[PDB]
Amino acid sequence: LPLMYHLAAVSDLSTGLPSFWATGWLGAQQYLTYNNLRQEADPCGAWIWENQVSWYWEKETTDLKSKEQLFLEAIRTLENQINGTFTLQGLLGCELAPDNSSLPTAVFALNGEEFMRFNPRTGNWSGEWPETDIVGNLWMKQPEAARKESEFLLTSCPERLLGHLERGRQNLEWKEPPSMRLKARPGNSGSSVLTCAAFSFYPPELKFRFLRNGLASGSGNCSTGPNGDGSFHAWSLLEVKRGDEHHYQCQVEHEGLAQPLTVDL
Amino acid sequence: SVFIFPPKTKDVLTITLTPKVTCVVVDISQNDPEVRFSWFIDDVEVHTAQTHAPEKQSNSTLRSVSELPIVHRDWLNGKTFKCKVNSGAFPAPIEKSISKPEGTPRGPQVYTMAPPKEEMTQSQVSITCMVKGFYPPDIYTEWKMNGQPQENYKNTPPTMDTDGSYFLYSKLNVKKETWQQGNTFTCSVLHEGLHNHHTEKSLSH
Amino acid sequence: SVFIFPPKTKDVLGGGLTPKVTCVVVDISQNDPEVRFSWFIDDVEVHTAQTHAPEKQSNSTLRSVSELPIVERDWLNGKTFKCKVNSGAFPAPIEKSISKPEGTPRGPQVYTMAPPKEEMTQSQVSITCMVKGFYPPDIYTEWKMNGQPQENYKNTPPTMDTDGSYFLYSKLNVKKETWQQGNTFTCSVLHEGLENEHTEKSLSH
Amino acid sequence: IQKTPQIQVYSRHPPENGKPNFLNCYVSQFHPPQIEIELLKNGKKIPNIEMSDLSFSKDWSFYILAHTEFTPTETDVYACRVKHVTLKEPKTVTWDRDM
Numbered sequence: 001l002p003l004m005y006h007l008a009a010v011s012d013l014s015t016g017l018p019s020f021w022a023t024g025w026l027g028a029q030q031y032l033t034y035n036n037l038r039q040e041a042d043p044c045g046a047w048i049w050e051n052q053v054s055w056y057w058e059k060e061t062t063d064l065k066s067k068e069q070l071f072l073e074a075i076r077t078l079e080n081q082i083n084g085t086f087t088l089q090g091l092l093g094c095e096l097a098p099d100n101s102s103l104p105t106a107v108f109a110l111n112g113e114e115f116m117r118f119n120p121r122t123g124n125w126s127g128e129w130p131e132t133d134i135v136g137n138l139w140m141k142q143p144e145a146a147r148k149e150s151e152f153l154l155t156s157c158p159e160r161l162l163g164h165l166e167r168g169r170q171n172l173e174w175k176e177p178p179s180m181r182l183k184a185r186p187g188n189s190g191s192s193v194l195t196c197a198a199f200s201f202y203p204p205e206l207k208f209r210f211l212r213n214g215l216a217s218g219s220g221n222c223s224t225g226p227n228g229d230g231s232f233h234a235w236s237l238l239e240v241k242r243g244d245e246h247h248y249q250c251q252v253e254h255e256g257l258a259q260p261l262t263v264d265l
Numbered sequence: 266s267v268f269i270f271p272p273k274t275k276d277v278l279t280i281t282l283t284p285k286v287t288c289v290v291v292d293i294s295q296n297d298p299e300v301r302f303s304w305f306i307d308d309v310e311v312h313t314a315q316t317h318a319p320e321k322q323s324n325s326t327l328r329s330v331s332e333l334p335i336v337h338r339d340w341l342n343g344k345t346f347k348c349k350v351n352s353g354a355f356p357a358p359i360e361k362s363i364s365k366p367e368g369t370p371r372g373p374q375v376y377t378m379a380p381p382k383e384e385m386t387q388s389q390v391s392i393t394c395m396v397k398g399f400y401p402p403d404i405y406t407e408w409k410m411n412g413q414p415q416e417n418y419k420n421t422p423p424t425m426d427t428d429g430s431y432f433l434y435s436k437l438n439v440k441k442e443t444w445q446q447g448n449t450f451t452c453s454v455l456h457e458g459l460h461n462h463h464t465e466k467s468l469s470h
Numbered sequence: 471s472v473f474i475f476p477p478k479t480k481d482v483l484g485g486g487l488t489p490k491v492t493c494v495v496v497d498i499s500q501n502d503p504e505v506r507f508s509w510f511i512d513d514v515e516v517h518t519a520q521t522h523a524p525e526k527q528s529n530s531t532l533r534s535v536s537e538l539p540i541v542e543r544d545w546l547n548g549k550t551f552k553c554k555v556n557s558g559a560f561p562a563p564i565e566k567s568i569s570k571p572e573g574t575p576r577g578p579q580v581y582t583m584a585p586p587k588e589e590m591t592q593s594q595v596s597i598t599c600m601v602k603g604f605y606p607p608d609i610y611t612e613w614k615m616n617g618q619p620q621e622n623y624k625n626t627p628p629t630m631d632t633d634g635s636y637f638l639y640s641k642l643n644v645k646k647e648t649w650q651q652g653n654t655f656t657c658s659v660l661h662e663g664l665e666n667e668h669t670e671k672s673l674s675h
Numbered sequence: 676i677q678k679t680p681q682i683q684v685y686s687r688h689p690p691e692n693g694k695p696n697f698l699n700c701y702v703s704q705f706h707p708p709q710i711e712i713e714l715l716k717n718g719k720k721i722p723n724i725e726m727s728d729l730s731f732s733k734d735w736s737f738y739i740l741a742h743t744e745f746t747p748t749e750t751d752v753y754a755c756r757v758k759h760v761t762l763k764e765p766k767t768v769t770w771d772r773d774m
């Protein structure tokens with residue numbers, strides 16, 4: 001179970017985006033949000049009620065104001081050397097060493113593709129691109145830069161994480177089995193399509209299995225998505241021989257379920 | 266007839282830009298110009314191209330173009346891009362394929378050279394740049410005065426040297442006065458063999 | 471695809487050999503050889519030529535070599551040379567004419583540059599000859615040591631400049647040593663625009 | 676590189692004509708992030724919809740969730756419509772009661 005911050009900055013403000021925003025993730029669930037306008041880092045739904053130290057959220061906001069500035073700088077220092085709008089993104093976080101410690105991550109992407117990396121131990125930015133030099137040098141040209149950024153990943157990160165584990169279990173251990181529903185549509189010509197939909201289940205982990213006359217018949221084409229409820233939604237499609245609709249069933253596997261679940265039309 | 270062209274070295278070497286693989290089809294005396302286009306990356310179809318409605322030239326023959334936006338690494342890592350053009354008129358589909366020219370990237374050594382004494386009399390002088398020992402011959406070179414990309418320069422084509430690598434010269438032209446005012450002239454080079462794909466050398470006095 | 475070729479400016483300008491309006495033929499399997507030759511210098515066929523028997527190459531083709539002799543007079547009078555080949559046993563045959571690039575001769579300004587201060591480190595170093603603004607592109611360059619012609623040099627192709635004229639550079643490569651210990655390095659140029667169709671600058675240390 | 680949107684429409688709980696539910700429009704796999712997303716009811720702009728914080732996967736492509744309340748009926752057809760650069764015209768994905 002990892003702690004991952006998704007940071008981003010843009011140039012083109014034609015559609016109302018802030019200039020820089022961010023979101024915190026504990027496993028598959030968001031617990032944090034931030035942007036340059038609200039100027040503060042705040043708790044997401046279910047985490048609002050977690051019990052934390054008084055300065056926890058003080059700390060997330062101040063640590064994000066730093067990164068905001070490093071990104072905003074890059075954005076302008078780039079928008080000047082180069083022609084054409086940009087999108088700065090970075091993936092900052094950690095996973096716990098199965099022996100209390102950090103397993104950091106820090107990669108940055110520019111206009112869709114990766115162009116830079118940070119080593120928190122060595123305190124150095126790596127990268128094979130022109131932009132890697134522009135941005136990478138802009139930051140390294142700040143005394144604070146390396147130190148802070150590094151402490152964020154090696155000290156703060158693993159800490160906050162270990163604290164959400166202790167004080168957040170109710171949330172991370174939460175389980176909810178899906179509600180299944182199988183159906184048939186006219187599909188192609190002289191054919192038909194079976195759809196196995198899974199409703200409102202938590203751990204996004206789920207295994208669809210098709211059954212013809214009882215024996216395995218495939219996996220269809222799985223697609224999972226968020227319900228916005230904090231839960232997830234999933235479906236699988238299987239085109240079959242028209243008329244034979246009824247010889248098939250659908251089965252699912254999930255932690256919400258003690259045993260595999262079989263559904264019919 | 267069909268033609269396949271690789272991306273500009275500039276777009277490929279700078280992440281912020283967009284490298285495109287191009288496929289052009291000429292000679293079409295008005296057949297079924299709805300000329301289909303199929304692209305593939307490592308033999309996998311893709312529907313991202315940007316085909317541009319045909320165009321008649323000064324020969325009554327129709328022409329067409331399909332640009333495929335490409336991911337900087339797909340190129341640098343060796344992926345093969347194929348574009349197959351189809352048409353009823355055509356017997357069997359015509360297909361072309363290209364990927365980055367094989368070979369260990371050898372990066373250039375760059376040097377700047379002032380106008381020659383004997384030239385210090387004419388109205389305009391010549392600021393020269395020697396770019397040598399690079400391979401493959403995929404490269405980019407431009408001039409900048411005080412960091413301002415300039416226009417009065419010509420690049421020699423890359424020329425295979427004796428040892429297999431390539432070199433080229435790039436000549437910036439300017440009014441003697443501009444040279445003498447002490448402005449800075451910079452030779453900028455983008456080659457995949459250089460650290461961060463780039464390097465630059467300035468000159469003054 | 472077979473295009474016509476022009477004479478080595480070395481020959482067409484005094485030299486020793488005789489200027490030959492060549493016409494190389496390629497694109498033929500190792501079993502379908504057939505490319506006749508009928509040269510018409512101004513709509514008049516001249517059997518003055520010699521087609522080196524239909525030889526062949528590895529990639530299954532014909533390393534064709536048909537050489538027609540001409541006069542330095544003809545070439546320099548906007549007079550053309552048609553390489554009309556007659557073959558009735560070859561799909562898409564060939565045929566291409568060529569004359570001197572009609573234009574007022576324009577002499578080059580030649581200058582020599584010493585290996586850059588920073589190249590003075592490397593094993594070998596580069597001795598550069600800038601050959602500025604000349605026309606037509608038919609030129610010839612080479613180096614010499616005290617008087618000794620050399621092999622270790624390469625010429626960029628003639629490159630069109632912003633003002634129509636042309637330029638190219640010639641890089642001579644030598645062991646650092648050959649430099650320190652002064653020597654005669656001379657840029658020898660052959661163009662129909664210099665005084666006596668030749669000139670040559672020199673430098674040492 | 677720029678990428679085209681992955682538009683998928685579906686409900687929160689199994690749909691049953693008449694009764695209150697929630698319509699979701701998941702837009703993922705795109706780049707750049709500037710985007711315009713809207714839900715429709717028989718063609719009109721269902722208003723006051725909620726949108727999740729904009730995020731992205733390990734591949735750096737952006738995913739976002741648009742959702743509002745609604746109640747199915749054999750008549751009313753709902754669909755999602757987005758506008759992005761990779762899109763020549765605005766793509767409209769119509770809801771499939773079986774997903």
Ligand SMILES: *[C@@H]1O[C@H](CO[C@H]2O[C@@H](C)[C@@H](O)[C@@H](O)[C@@H]2O)[C@@H](O[C@@H]2O[C@H](CO)[C@@H](O[C@@H]3O[C@H](CO[C@H]4O[C@H](CO)[C@@H](O)[C@H](O)[C@@H]4O[C@@H]4O[C@H](CO)[C@@H](O)[C@H](O)[C@H]4NC(C)=O)[C@@H](O)[C@H](O[C@H]4O[C@H](CO)[C@@H](O)[C@H](O)[C@@H]4O[C@@H]4O[C@H](CO)[C@@H](O)[C@H](O)[C@H]4NC(C)=O)[C@@H]3O)[C@H](O)[C@H]2NC(C)=O)[C@H](O)[C@H]1NC(C)=O
Pocket residue numbers: 266268269270271287289291292322323324326328361362471
């Ligand atoms: C009607 O007009 C059409 C267009 O207008 C032209 O009219 C004529 C009269 C001309 O004089 C001008 O007035 C106009 O340009 C005619 O179309 C032409 O058709 C010919 C047919 O052979 C095409 O020839 C090919 O040309 C390419 C080079 O094209 C580049 O340069 C052009 C200028 O010279 C430029 O216009 C092109 O755009 C193109 O430039 C590139 O463009 C792309 C995008 O478009 C950019 O991204 C690039 O940056 C830019 N590059 C730069 C820099 O310039 C040439 O490469 C082709 O050579 C191949 O074929 C030869 C013959 O078969 C062969 O000998 C070569 O070897 C080569 O083949 C490849 O060989 C390698 C190794 O040798 C192998 O590894 C490959 O496998 C092999 N190819 C493969 C994969 O099979 C070729 O000569 C010409 O390009 C085209 N004009 C256009 C458009 O560009 C039309 O013919 C005419 N109709 C008629 C007949 O009446």
Ligand SMILES: *[C@@H]1O[C@H](CO[C@H]2O[C@@H](C)[C@@H](O)[C@@H](O)[C@@H]2O)[C@@H](O[C@@H]2O[C@H](CO)[C@@H](O[C@@H]3O[C@H](CO[C@H]4O[C@H](CO)[C@@H](O)[C@H](O)[C@@H]4O[C@@H]4O[C@H](CO)[C@@H](O)[C@H](O)[C@H]4NC(C)=O)[C@@H](O)[C@H](O[C@H]4O[C@H](CO)[C@@H](O)[C@H](O)[C@@H]4O[C@@H]4O[C@H](CO)[C@@H](O)[C@H](O)[C@H]4NC(C)=O)[C@@H]3O)[C@H](O)[C@H]2NC(C)=O)[C@H](O)[C@H]1NC(C)=O
Pocket residue numbers: 471472473474475476477478492494496497498527529530531533566567
């Ligand atoms: C089997 O192998 C054959 C030979 O072996 C080669 O194999 C390939 C794999 C190669 O990689 C090597 O391994 C081997 O060389 C292949 O034959 C080739 O076929 C192509 C077909 O297009 C020929 O292409 C033309 O090339 C000329 C340049 O040729 C010079 O340079 C060569 C080295 O690069 C050299 O080998 C040649 O000998 C030649 O050198 C000159 O040679 C003469 C005498 O031979 C000497 O006296 C000279 O000193 C020497 N010059 C110097 C110095 O080097 C190129 O100029 C042609 O360009 C024309 O066509 C283009 C495409 O149509 C077009 O874009 C250009 O613009 C140009 O067209 C002219 O354009 C101007 C203005 O732009 C117009 O004004 C003109 O009107 C117009 N032409 C006209 C009149 O219509 C062209 O690219 C290639 O030369 C040939 N190889 C040989 C032999 O030299 C064979 O293809 C292969 N079979 C296959 C396909 O499997």
Ligand SMILES: *[C@H]1O[C@H](CO[C@H]2O[C@@H](C)[C@@H](O)[C@@H](O)[C@@H]2O)[C@@H](O[C@@H]2O[C@H](CO)[C@@H](O[C@@H]3O[C@H](CO)[C@@H](O)[C@H](O[C@H]4O[C@H](CO)[C@@H](O)[C@H](O)[C@@H]4O[C@H]4O[C@H](CO)[C@@H](O)[C@H](O)[C@H]4NC(C)=O)[C@@H]3O)[C@H](O)[C@H]2NC(C)=O)[C@H](O)[C@H]1NC(C)=O
Pocket residue numbers: 122124125126127128129132133136137373374375376460461464465466588
């Ligand atoms: C992290 O900190 C630094 C900097 O990080 C940066 O590294 C980049 C490679 C890239 O990853 C960026 O994203 C990142 O921000 C790391 O140390 C750096 O090490 C490089 C390698 O030596 C060094 O590069 C030199 O840069 C200066 C200008 O800033 C250049 O002048 C110099 O060029 C000459 O030397 C190099 C090799 O030393 C040659 O490759 C060049 O070709 C050139 O040599 C000569 O030949 C060329 C041929 O064209 C000529 O043009 C030149 O004129 C000629 N040299 C002469 C005489 O000038 C180098 O490229 C960086 O300077 C250095 N970082 C800095 C800016 O201090 C560090 O290793 C890393 N930490 C860890 C833990 O590794």
Ligand SMILES: *[C@H]1O[C@H](CO[C@H]2O[C@@H](C)[C@@H](O)[C@@H](O)[C@@H]2O)[C@@H](O)[C@H](O)[C@H]1NC(C)=O
Pocket residue numbers: 099100166
């Ligand atoms: C390091 O801590 C690991 C996690 O345990 C923490 O949380 C509670 C369980 C608390 O009581 C403490 O144990 C820790 O703060 C734990 O699994 C490891 O055993 C610890 N390492 C050791 C052995 O010192």
Ligand SMILES: *[C@@H]1O[C@H](CO)[C@@H](O)[C@H](O)[C@H]1NC(C)=O
Pocket residue numbers: 220221237238239
């Ligand atoms: C199933 O998904 C694959 C994706 O790789 C697709 O190619 C195929 O057409 C789909 N078939 C179905 C079940 O509709």
Ligand SMILES: *[C@H]1O[C@H](CO)[C@@H](O)[C@H](O)[C@H]1NC(C)=O
Pocket residue numbers: 083084
């Ligand atoms: C920026 O580069 C030049 C600037 O003149 C031009 O191509 C355009 O304004 C910009 N690039 C494009 C084509 O998007």
